[PDB]
Amino acid sequence: TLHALLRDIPAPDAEAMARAQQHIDGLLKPPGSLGRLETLAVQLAGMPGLNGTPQVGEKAVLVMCADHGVWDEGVAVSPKIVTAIQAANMTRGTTGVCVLAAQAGAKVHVIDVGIDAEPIPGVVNMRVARGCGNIAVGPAMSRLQAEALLLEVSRYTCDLAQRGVTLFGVGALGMANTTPAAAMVSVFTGSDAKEVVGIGANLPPSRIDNKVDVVRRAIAINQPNPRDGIDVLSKVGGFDLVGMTGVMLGAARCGLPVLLDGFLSYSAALAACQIAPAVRPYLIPSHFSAEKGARIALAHLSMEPYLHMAMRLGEGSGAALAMPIVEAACAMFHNMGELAASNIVL
Amino acid sequence: TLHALLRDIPAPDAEAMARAQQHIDGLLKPPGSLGRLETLAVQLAGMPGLNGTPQVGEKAVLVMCADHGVWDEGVAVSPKIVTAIQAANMTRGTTGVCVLAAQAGAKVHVIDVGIDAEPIPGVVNMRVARGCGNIAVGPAMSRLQAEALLLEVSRYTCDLAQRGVTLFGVGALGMANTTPAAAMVSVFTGSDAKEVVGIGANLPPSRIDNKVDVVRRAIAINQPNPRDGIDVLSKVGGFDLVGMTGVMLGAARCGLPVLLDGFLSYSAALAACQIAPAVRPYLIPSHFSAEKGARIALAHLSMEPYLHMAMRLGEGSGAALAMPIVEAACAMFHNMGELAASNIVL
Ligand SMILES: Nc1ncnc2[nH]cnc12
Ligand SMILES: Nc1ncnc2[nH]cnc12
């Protein structure tokens, strides 16, 4: 039902947004003084799954895990098995995103969408294959596979709204995944690879040329169509990137907010917004990733992150870190007194 | 005892910082990937009142309230009595900083250092006078008054460390106070008034020239010495700015972190750091204020805020908003697993 899913993403609710603006202007402060807390509160009020008001109930960070055949091109200094080890660490609460999610009172959902290892007990199993194809020589997956994964993850995501989740975050875990992320960013924005290829997980300065060349080769051989984000995902993305796009389609379909993380997630967000522009009003940035291509990706999303933390972990820890800011916008909205009640005219 | 206070601010503890760096590098993530969470955790580990480790116990936001005779120069469109009304609102929990402090689990301490109204029951009374002098025609206060206020507020601040507070935030509330803040910023940084004078609380575009002229007049008539921050405070600052400087001197003397808020607080921080450069390692930025002179002030502090919220409320709400980030750095530090325990070498 993918066509129906995309078709049925709701528009933001202009009426609820006008009522929200009106309330904010009347609060106990100079009009506009809380800046982007104000604009964030109105954006949230517009999302139909929030029931006409900025609010946060339960929070979930979905961490999408997979391996990538492009690891064989020597674009990642972390050994391949780190994806599987770290995915298992997610079930024990010891990773960055686990710790930051706990701090924010969010639950982490670890989803294996294609790790090249035995299944990890405890991890949600949506595995497409044991790793995707090497994008340097051919596609990451078939279109059927990318579509099926989008539908499954989007259904999983919107189903969490039944258990009270009203705010998602997304992240990805997959050795070498900054390579397809950079291929996709280059394709969607028209920037040359050299401008959007970063060091990812501490790649030595001397291997950057190889990684730029591998991105260009992937684009050259696959010839992804920039106007078909599912084509771009299936050809030069990865299962974890498709997985993050699926969380965004599902949150949007559910009329609910989703916090981006870093560059991996911006690449997925570019795909999501190409596939269904109606996704865009549900997306909330968290932080401004240290990765080279972060600025270019965020400009094409017309997004300005709240947090400048020079972070590049990418598995959702940035999204978790911004959940308190969303909660702060709701608290301001609901808990502030009003000017009129103090007799103050400004 | 002001000379003794300044003399006895402790140096950061290099040994504790080295032990902290070592621990962070060994955590379950690529080295350096949590970016400024890492550097923040080490900075905190260095502050002797934190006992050799990044941690947060109790949190306090001190909101310093006073009126300013420069209001008579027509530099503020908010009526003067708003300082007193809002200070009373602080005791009822309905202001921005109250709401955001509650969200962060911090307590707000509202301190009247010179409101031009009857005493507000419920507010800490350290009032120097009912408003300071009009800085456009003479000094805000005598040096004796500024010194006495610094000592009192710094003693109050460090005394909260007995009740378990380990993290402060600062803010100010005072109609017209962006005028002395801009005078001080101009004096300490050598920037012309026109570069650092902002709209404060929604001053109409057409009154900006007057406010620039009033800043220049204040500097011209008082001739504050840029190398004596107490001179600058007493001549062209205000009681609320001196009050914020006092919180920074006291937190530093106590070897404890203090979160800045916006432009008002940056002006106080410039004074604090001129008076005692040993204050600087205790200061943590929160957000990048929307005020015109924010960039210049923060450059002279070599500070890069975490949060880009286009905020300009200024009464501590920014400081409260960043308390979760400090807590997040401690959680990362204490709660993450270690690479070695997973057999991972990167
Ligand atoms: N000008 C202003 N009006 C109302 N509340 C405030 N808090 C800080 N500044 C203020
Ligand atoms: N390269 C990497 N190593 C360890 N943990 C991670 N989490 C995300 N990326 C990682």
XYZ file of C-alpha atoms and ligand atoms in Angstrom:
712
model
C 0.000 0.000 0.000
C 2.889 2.518 -0.596
C 1.024 4.762 -3.040
C -1.881 5.023 -0.547
C 0.552 5.749 2.300
C 2.165 8.685 0.471
C -1.216 9.973 -0.805
C -2.721 10.004 2.676
C -0.018 11.977 4.592
C -2.025 14.780 6.112
C -1.484 18.474 5.462
C -0.575 20.558 8.555
C -3.563 22.003 10.324
C -3.531 25.732 9.631
C -6.381 26.403 12.052
C -4.532 24.797 15.023
C -1.386 26.740 14.072
C -3.274 30.077 14.083
C -4.765 29.287 17.503
C -1.286 28.393 18.726
C 0.319 31.622 17.447
C -2.408 33.612 19.084
C -1.786 31.889 22.434
C 1.987 32.384 22.264
C 1.722 36.051 21.490
C -0.403 36.546 24.619
C 2.097 34.854 26.973
C 4.167 36.708 29.656
C 7.076 37.908 27.594
C 7.891 40.407 24.792
C 6.256 39.023 21.616
C 8.773 36.873 19.653
C 11.368 36.846 22.474
C 11.437 33.060 22.831
C 12.366 32.895 19.170
C 12.510 29.414 17.677
C 10.833 27.866 20.736
C 7.810 29.826 19.451
C 8.045 28.755 15.889
C 8.670 25.129 17.006
C 5.552 25.206 19.230
C 3.389 26.369 16.282
C 4.946 23.800 13.912
C 4.072 21.043 16.442
C 0.490 22.407 16.907
C 0.025 21.928 13.145
C 0.833 18.163 13.207
C -2.551 16.365 13.310
C -1.331 13.458 15.452
C -0.669 15.992 18.295
C -4.334 16.771 18.602
C -4.232 20.543 17.970
C -1.618 21.442 20.545
C 2.181 21.260 21.094
C 2.643 18.238 23.316
C 4.971 15.246 23.892
C 3.794 11.944 25.316
C 6.058 8.944 24.818
C 9.292 9.264 22.801
C 11.006 6.700 20.596
C 14.373 6.723 18.814
C 14.495 4.191 15.944
C 18.005 3.111 15.139
C 18.280 1.451 11.741
C 21.175 -1.015 11.388
C 22.676 -2.598 8.292
C 25.920 -3.405 6.540
C 27.011 -2.233 3.118
C 28.976 -4.018 0.378
C 30.788 -0.736 -0.392
C 32.817 -1.425 2.836
C 34.917 -3.651 0.503
C 36.102 -0.470 -1.373
C 38.132 0.501 1.765
C 35.986 3.621 2.470
C 35.624 2.804 6.225
C 38.401 2.150 8.755
C 36.021 0.515 11.266
C 35.984 -3.332 10.792
C 32.667 -4.577 9.309
C 31.686 -6.536 12.377
C 31.401 -3.330 14.416
C 27.818 -2.928 13.038
C 26.770 -6.233 14.653
C 28.713 -5.688 17.853
C 27.239 -2.232 18.359
C 23.721 -3.384 17.456
C 24.032 -5.907 20.291
C 25.345 -3.155 22.545
C 22.141 -1.268 21.799
C 20.141 -4.060 23.509
C 22.286 -3.518 26.684
C 21.906 0.252 26.893
C 25.633 1.117 26.662
C 25.790 3.059 23.374
C 25.629 6.837 22.978
C 22.076 6.879 21.665
C 20.952 4.528 24.511
C 22.459 6.811 27.142
C 21.083 10.021 25.597
C 17.670 8.475 24.923
C 17.493 7.412 28.619
C 18.392 10.971 29.624
C 15.547 12.252 27.508
C 13.113 9.611 28.777
C 12.864 8.052 25.270
C 12.929 4.336 24.414
C 15.348 3.059 21.758
C 14.075 0.701 19.092
C 16.983 -1.118 17.442
C 15.967 -2.407 14.031
C 18.159 -4.727 11.951
C 17.328 -3.961 8.336
C 20.320 -5.826 6.828
C 23.285 -6.530 9.187
C 25.810 -9.004 7.636
C 25.912 -11.313 10.634
C 23.638 -13.755 12.416
C 20.383 -12.254 13.807
C 20.897 -10.546 17.207
C 18.400 -11.738 19.783
C 16.584 -8.726 21.142
C 16.804 -6.654 17.948
C 13.743 -6.045 15.749
C 14.294 -8.198 12.631
C 13.380 -6.543 9.357
C 16.508 -7.720 7.549
C 16.412 -7.337 3.764
C 19.698 -9.223 3.102
C 22.973 -9.761 4.919
C 24.345 -6.383 3.808
C 23.329 -4.472 0.676
C 25.047 -4.676 -2.687
C 28.303 -2.749 -3.226
C 27.097 0.533 -4.702
C 30.481 1.040 -6.442
C 29.644 -1.797 -8.949
C 25.882 -1.966 -9.106
C 22.769 -1.226 -7.032
C 22.431 -1.491 -3.235
C 19.091 -3.368 -3.702
C 16.132 -3.830 -6.025
C 13.333 -1.266 -6.098
C 10.967 -3.919 -4.761
C 13.207 -4.410 -1.805
C 13.435 -0.641 -1.058
C 9.662 -0.237 -1.390
C 8.886 -3.189 0.804
C 11.281 -1.891 3.520
C 9.745 1.626 3.421
C 6.276 0.139 3.929
C 7.288 -2.161 6.723
C 9.238 0.461 8.672
C 6.573 3.133 8.094
C 3.899 0.720 9.410
C 6.017 -0.132 12.440
C 6.595 3.583 13.131
C 2.940 4.644 12.849
C 1.947 1.623 14.983
C 3.995 3.028 17.879
C 1.512 5.902 17.910
C -0.941 3.270 19.489
C 1.236 2.820 22.417
C 1.362 6.503 23.065
C 4.481 7.600 21.168
C 4.130 11.195 19.867
C 7.741 12.134 19.061
C 10.229 10.064 17.116
C 13.965 10.379 16.503
C 15.910 8.488 13.822
C 19.472 7.239 13.491
C 21.539 4.736 11.611
C 24.318 2.292 12.400
C 26.255 0.648 9.566
C 29.978 0.593 8.791
C 30.705 2.528 5.587
C 27.236 4.172 5.548
C 28.560 7.736 5.199
C 29.521 6.638 1.630
C 25.975 5.989 0.309
C 24.761 8.976 2.418
C 27.233 11.149 0.496
C 26.278 9.580 -2.847
C 22.607 10.405 -2.148
C 23.353 13.920 -0.967
C 25.355 14.544 -4.159
C 22.545 13.165 -6.342
C 19.677 15.082 -4.707
C 21.460 18.438 -4.351
C 23.625 18.307 -7.551
C 26.784 18.894 -5.568
C 29.936 17.135 -6.720
C 31.063 14.274 -4.457
C 34.171 16.185 -3.374
C 31.942 18.748 -1.652
C 29.882 16.260 0.399
C 32.237 13.361 1.193
C 33.422 13.465 4.841
C 35.824 11.527 7.153
C 32.861 9.549 8.706
C 34.343 7.403 11.521
C 37.876 8.952 11.546
C 38.904 7.915 8.018
C 42.566 9.044 7.557
C 42.983 12.199 5.481
C 44.855 10.140 2.830
C 41.887 7.897 1.983
C 39.498 10.699 1.222
C 40.329 10.663 -2.524
C 39.421 7.008 -2.749
C 36.122 7.661 -1.007
C 35.348 10.587 -3.365
C 36.184 8.304 -6.309
C 33.957 5.478 -4.983
C 30.990 7.925 -4.620
C 31.454 9.162 -8.178
C 31.722 5.567 -9.458
C 28.548 4.581 -7.668
C 26.689 7.468 -9.273
C 28.224 6.872 -12.706
C 27.429 3.134 -12.770
C 23.924 3.292 -11.244
C 22.650 6.469 -12.845
C 20.164 7.195 -10.095
C 17.266 9.520 -11.069
C 17.292 12.588 -8.660
C 13.511 12.994 -9.235
C 12.686 9.500 -8.000
C 13.941 9.222 -4.379
C 13.103 5.477 -4.222
C 15.310 4.978 -7.340
C 18.131 6.918 -5.597
C 17.731 4.938 -2.379
C 17.666 1.553 -4.054
C 20.665 2.307 -6.331
C 23.126 4.301 -4.217
C 21.685 4.249 -0.667
C 21.626 1.319 1.855
C 19.043 -0.556 3.959
C 19.695 1.677 7.010
C 19.126 4.849 4.948
C 15.920 3.410 3.448
C 14.954 2.438 7.013
C 15.312 6.068 8.233
C 13.318 7.326 5.244
C 10.605 4.810 6.237
C 10.470 6.220 9.792
C 9.952 9.704 8.286
C 7.193 8.494 5.922
C 5.493 6.750 8.783
C 5.702 9.624 11.281
C 4.367 11.900 8.573
C 1.545 9.560 7.678
C 0.720 9.490 11.432
C 0.795 13.335 11.532
C 3.649 13.197 14.081
C 7.079 14.900 14.547
C 10.372 13.224 13.810
C 13.775 14.610 14.959
C 16.632 14.159 12.526
C 20.134 13.288 13.794
C 23.119 14.001 11.506
C 24.351 13.608 7.938
C 23.156 9.985 7.497
C 19.652 11.110 8.534
C 19.819 14.257 6.328
C 20.446 12.031 3.317
C 17.346 9.951 4.252
C 15.375 13.143 4.791
C 16.294 14.344 1.329
C 14.917 11.123 -0.135
C 11.760 11.284 2.040
C 10.983 14.834 0.934
C 11.571 14.059 -2.743
C 9.261 10.990 -2.532
C 6.571 12.922 -0.617
C 7.022 16.665 -0.118
C 4.207 16.513 2.441
C 6.793 14.881 4.837
C 8.666 18.125 5.264
C 6.503 19.855 7.889
C 6.898 16.862 10.239
C 10.726 16.977 10.223
C 12.557 18.739 13.090
C 16.311 19.162 12.976
C 18.376 18.422 16.001
C 22.028 19.249 15.513
C 24.398 20.465 12.793
C 26.584 17.455 12.018
C 30.391 17.846 11.792
C 30.401 15.904 8.479
C 31.623 17.811 5.467
C 28.383 17.613 3.504
C 26.138 18.691 6.417
C 25.765 22.328 5.333
C 24.778 21.453 1.762
C 22.271 18.814 2.845
C 20.603 21.092 5.413
C 20.435 24.001 2.899
C 18.561 21.853 0.460
C 16.104 20.967 3.284
C 15.981 24.703 4.280
C 16.760 23.517 7.753
C 18.648 25.234 10.554
C 19.527 22.878 13.437
C 19.051 23.911 17.067
C 22.274 22.366 18.360
C 25.841 23.021 17.324
C 27.684 20.142 19.033
C 30.283 19.186 16.329
C 28.849 15.716 16.663
C 29.132 12.918 14.122
C 28.065 9.725 15.974
C 24.867 9.472 13.837
C 23.006 6.589 15.426
C 20.311 8.765 16.894
C 22.226 10.342 19.788
C 21.690 13.866 18.226
C 17.938 13.278 17.881
C 17.746 12.144 21.526
C 19.725 15.244 22.599
C 17.087 17.564 21.054
C 14.032 15.884 22.628
C 14.263 18.199 25.666
C 14.068 21.208 23.347
C 10.794 19.952 21.862
C 9.534 19.359 25.408
C 10.689 22.886 26.373
C 8.565 24.401 23.535
C 5.479 22.544 24.873
C 6.213 23.592 28.472
C 6.562 27.268 27.438
C 3.245 26.968 25.548
C 1.227 25.297 28.296
C 2.839 26.562 31.492
C 3.559 30.288 30.911
C 1.209 32.911 32.325
C -0.425 35.549 30.152
C 0.271 39.260 29.685
C -3.343 40.214 30.038
C -3.582 38.533 33.442
C -0.767 40.868 34.677
C -2.348 43.951 33.066
C 0.781 44.427 30.921
C 0.431 46.009 27.457
C 3.720 46.193 25.458
C 36.836 40.407 51.364
C 36.689 41.013 47.536
C 40.445 40.924 46.928
C 40.645 37.580 48.800
C 37.669 36.235 46.831
C 39.282 36.976 43.453
C 42.723 35.756 44.633
C 41.337 32.431 45.817
C 39.392 31.321 42.677
C 40.883 27.931 41.990
C 42.708 26.932 38.822
C 41.102 24.055 36.853
C 42.379 20.659 37.847
C 44.549 19.440 34.984
C 44.955 15.984 36.508
C 41.158 15.370 36.681
C 40.824 16.632 33.092
C 43.487 14.177 31.833
C 41.751 11.290 33.620
C 38.470 12.410 32.077
C 39.864 12.597 28.518
C 41.325 9.166 28.923
C 37.950 7.752 30.014
C 36.059 9.400 27.148
C 38.431 8.134 24.523
C 37.858 4.566 25.746
C 34.043 4.758 25.516
C 31.912 2.836 22.929
C 32.106 5.170 19.986
C 34.629 6.477 17.401
C 37.044 8.750 19.318
C 35.847 12.404 19.151
C 32.441 11.506 17.638
C 30.405 13.051 20.455
C 32.189 16.307 19.740
C 31.468 19.131 22.163
C 29.727 16.784 24.619
C 33.274 15.421 25.058
C 34.981 18.706 25.486
C 32.191 19.863 27.864
C 32.609 16.709 29.997
C 36.370 17.369 30.365
C 35.815 21.078 31.120
C 33.385 20.071 33.921
C 35.833 17.415 35.284
C 38.362 20.246 35.716
C 36.093 22.345 38.012
C 37.193 21.540 41.596
C 33.709 21.868 43.106
C 32.623 18.851 40.947
C 34.953 16.551 42.794
C 37.063 15.299 39.858
C 34.238 14.159 37.623
C 31.543 15.600 35.293
C 28.401 15.568 37.394
C 25.253 17.625 38.142
C 23.477 17.563 41.482
C 21.070 20.400 42.212
C 20.632 23.266 39.716
C 19.877 26.922 40.375
C 19.067 29.813 38.030
C 19.708 33.214 39.670
C 17.657 35.958 38.120
C 18.959 39.415 38.972
C 16.332 42.185 38.894
C 16.745 45.950 38.902
C 15.603 49.151 37.262
C 17.755 51.675 35.452
C 17.564 55.483 35.327
C 18.525 55.360 31.623
C 14.878 54.205 31.006
C 14.136 57.979 31.147
C 16.149 58.442 27.865
C 13.332 56.575 25.995
C 15.589 53.581 25.112
C 12.952 50.980 26.197
C 9.338 50.681 25.016
C 8.334 48.459 27.965
C 6.880 50.607 30.847
C 9.241 50.763 33.872
C 6.891 48.926 36.178
C 7.208 45.757 34.088
C 10.423 44.936 36.060
C 8.444 44.791 39.329
C 5.440 43.037 37.840
C 7.587 40.347 36.250
C 9.728 39.931 39.374
C 6.505 39.134 41.238
C 5.524 36.760 38.449
C 8.788 34.944 39.096
C 7.549 34.044 42.614
C 4.440 32.404 40.993
C 6.281 30.298 38.429
C 4.629 31.797 35.311
C 7.603 33.423 33.546
C 9.715 31.870 30.794
C 12.703 31.183 33.019
C 10.402 29.631 35.700
C 8.838 27.284 33.159
C 12.163 26.294 31.561
C 13.909 25.940 34.926
C 11.086 23.584 36.069
C 11.546 21.575 32.870
C 15.219 21.237 33.650
C 14.597 20.396 37.313
C 16.329 23.644 38.428
C 15.126 26.063 41.120
C 14.848 29.781 40.320
C 16.261 32.298 42.760
C 14.780 35.743 42.109
C 17.028 38.436 43.532
C 16.021 42.106 43.700
C 19.249 44.071 43.447
C 17.603 47.471 42.783
C 13.967 47.410 41.506
C 12.344 50.911 41.603
C 9.236 49.796 43.454
C 8.274 48.550 46.895
C 9.983 45.288 47.998
C 8.234 42.173 46.590
C 7.463 39.640 49.287
C 9.043 36.359 48.308
C 11.980 37.884 46.410
C 15.522 37.824 47.832
C 16.248 41.431 48.890
C 19.713 42.684 48.047
C 18.505 46.048 46.758
C 21.231 48.663 46.298
C 18.845 51.574 45.508
C 15.459 51.987 43.869
C 16.950 51.869 40.363
C 20.501 52.848 39.403
C 21.603 56.265 38.215
C 20.926 57.277 34.593
C 24.137 56.280 32.833
C 23.515 58.921 30.116
C 24.342 61.747 32.640
C 26.594 60.195 35.234
C 27.416 56.843 36.857
C 24.993 53.962 37.514
C 26.406 53.643 41.092
C 29.471 54.227 43.242
C 32.368 51.775 43.157
C 31.656 50.919 46.787
C 28.155 49.974 45.866
C 29.281 47.748 42.935
C 31.921 46.053 45.095
C 29.564 45.434 47.957
C 26.962 43.900 45.575
C 29.571 41.606 43.942
C 30.599 40.312 47.372
C 27.091 39.768 48.606
C 25.873 37.979 45.476
C 29.073 35.917 45.191
C 28.668 34.822 48.843
C 25.024 33.934 48.276
C 25.953 31.937 45.152
C 28.796 29.950 46.744
C 26.575 29.309 49.797
C 24.109 27.428 47.575
C 26.895 24.899 47.056
C 26.084 23.812 50.744
C 22.658 22.838 49.831
C 23.869 20.679 47.025
C 23.782 23.037 44.030
C 26.517 22.159 41.484
C 25.347 24.001 38.352
C 24.192 27.590 38.145
C 22.530 29.639 35.412
C 22.264 33.443 35.383
C 19.792 35.934 33.954
C 18.643 39.482 34.355
C 15.342 41.332 34.408
C 15.297 45.131 34.189
C 13.577 47.470 31.731
C 16.155 49.301 29.602
C 18.999 46.944 30.649
C 20.102 46.147 27.083
C 21.372 49.787 27.052
C 24.039 49.435 29.791
C 24.758 45.884 28.480
C 25.570 47.452 25.103
C 27.607 50.255 26.701
C 29.704 47.635 28.542
C 30.118 45.443 25.488
C 31.325 48.475 23.503
C 33.785 49.455 26.252
C 35.297 45.994 26.803
C 35.567 44.977 23.133
C 36.331 48.446 21.608
C 33.429 48.151 19.211
C 31.503 51.307 18.384
C 28.016 51.479 19.929
C 26.352 51.213 16.517
C 27.729 47.680 16.169
C 26.442 46.354 19.519
C 23.177 48.216 20.193
C 20.123 45.981 19.562
C 16.278 46.274 19.579
C 16.090 44.663 23.110
C 12.362 44.249 23.919
C 10.973 45.144 20.433
C 12.205 48.757 20.315
C 10.866 50.274 17.029
C 13.452 50.542 14.258
C 13.132 54.369 14.405
C 14.404 54.679 17.989
C 17.622 52.821 17.412
C 19.579 56.035 16.659
C 18.566 57.501 19.984
C 19.675 54.353 21.775
C 23.046 54.386 19.942
C 23.428 58.057 20.922
C 22.560 57.356 24.590
C 25.215 54.553 24.730
C 27.858 56.857 23.275
C 26.870 59.631 25.716
C 27.113 57.277 28.656
C 30.612 56.259 27.615
C 31.686 59.828 26.838
C 30.462 61.264 30.161
C 31.606 58.415 32.445
C 34.890 57.531 30.800
C 34.889 53.971 32.064
C 38.327 52.261 32.167
C 38.152 49.023 29.998
C 40.958 47.506 32.147
C 39.009 47.838 35.388
C 35.753 45.836 34.996
C 34.404 47.090 38.367
C 34.919 50.689 37.094
C 33.003 49.782 33.890
C 30.201 48.112 35.839
C 29.768 50.930 38.317
C 29.843 53.679 35.635
C 27.921 52.299 32.651
C 26.413 48.991 33.860
C 23.425 48.449 36.254
C 22.697 46.551 39.491
C 21.341 43.515 37.577
C 24.510 43.306 35.443
C 26.726 43.618 38.540
C 24.500 40.952 40.127
C 25.172 38.496 37.244
C 28.906 39.220 37.427
C 28.689 38.396 41.163
C 27.084 35.004 40.415
C 30.002 34.255 38.048
C 32.628 35.314 40.625
C 30.940 33.197 43.230
C 30.508 30.069 41.093
C 34.139 30.410 40.095
C 35.312 30.870 43.653
C 33.296 27.703 44.482
C 34.973 25.855 41.554
C 31.542 25.334 39.938
C 29.996 25.778 36.432
C 27.753 28.650 35.475
C 25.626 28.719 32.267
C 25.326 32.084 30.573
C 22.013 33.170 29.000
C 22.083 35.940 26.358
C 23.521 39.373 25.620
C 22.834 40.853 29.096
C 24.749 37.917 30.624
C 27.565 38.169 28.015
C 28.142 41.766 29.085
C 28.395 40.602 32.745
C 30.691 37.780 31.681
C 32.984 40.240 29.960
C 33.265 42.213 33.191
C 33.777 39.037 35.284
C 36.616 37.837 33.063
C 38.328 41.233 33.029
C 38.130 41.444 36.865
C 39.360 37.848 37.306
C 40.504 35.923 34.233
C 40.416 32.767 36.359
C 36.549 32.939 36.030
C 36.667 31.964 32.390
C 37.023 28.175 32.680
C 33.851 28.004 34.811
C 31.649 29.741 32.204
C 29.497 27.613 29.855
C 27.546 29.245 27.060
C 23.987 28.284 26.443
C 22.532 29.958 23.388
C 23.484 32.529 20.746
C 21.302 35.542 21.517
C 19.378 37.298 18.704
C 20.650 40.701 19.948
C 22.796 42.632 17.525
C 25.914 42.691 19.685
C 25.827 38.955 20.535
C 28.452 37.885 17.984
C 30.980 40.516 19.068
C 30.524 39.780 22.766
C 30.881 36.006 22.315
C 33.988 36.446 20.087
C 35.705 38.415 22.780
C 34.887 35.571 25.238
C 36.042 33.009 22.579
C 32.743 31.324 23.172
C 30.580 29.293 20.815
C 27.066 28.647 22.183
C 25.439 25.217 21.947
C 21.961 26.472 21.065
C 20.836 28.599 18.161
C 17.281 29.528 19.214
C 17.078 33.213 18.052
C 16.094 33.928 21.620
C 16.298 37.282 23.374
C 14.227 36.898 26.587
C 17.409 37.133 28.750
C 16.124 36.431 32.237
C 17.764 33.054 32.470
C 15.460 31.032 30.206
C 18.443 30.297 27.819
C 20.618 29.088 30.707
C 17.805 26.798 31.912
C 17.368 25.455 28.350
C 21.026 24.298 28.250
C 21.017 22.486 31.619
C 19.956 19.226 29.920
C 22.998 19.460 27.647
C 25.330 19.643 30.652
C 23.466 16.675 32.147
C 23.786 14.830 28.800
C 27.616 15.260 28.886
C 27.699 13.694 32.394
C 25.382 10.843 31.348
C 27.565 10.052 28.297
C 30.635 10.069 30.588
C 29.243 7.855 33.341
C 26.773 5.612 31.530
C 28.461 4.630 28.224
C 30.141 1.243 27.892
C 33.765 0.874 26.853
C 35.386 -0.198 23.582
C 37.737 -2.591 25.267
C 34.856 -4.465 26.897
C 33.462 -5.181 23.370
C 36.892 -6.157 21.997
C 36.673 -3.317 19.447
C 39.896 -1.625 18.275
C 39.351 1.317 15.847
N 10.563 43.319 28.539
C 10.067 42.271 29.176
N 8.737 42.126 29.323
C 8.240 41.072 29.993
N 8.966 40.116 30.549
C 10.294 40.112 30.508
N 11.265 39.334 30.979
C 12.399 39.856 30.582
N 12.229 40.974 29.870
C 10.939 41.235 29.782
N 31.935 3.539 13.691
C 31.321 3.323 14.843
N 31.945 2.663 15.836
C 31.308 2.424 16.995
N 30.067 2.794 17.270
C 29.307 3.444 16.396
N 28.060 3.908 16.369
C 27.892 4.488 15.207
N 28.982 4.417 14.435
C 29.925 3.761 15.083
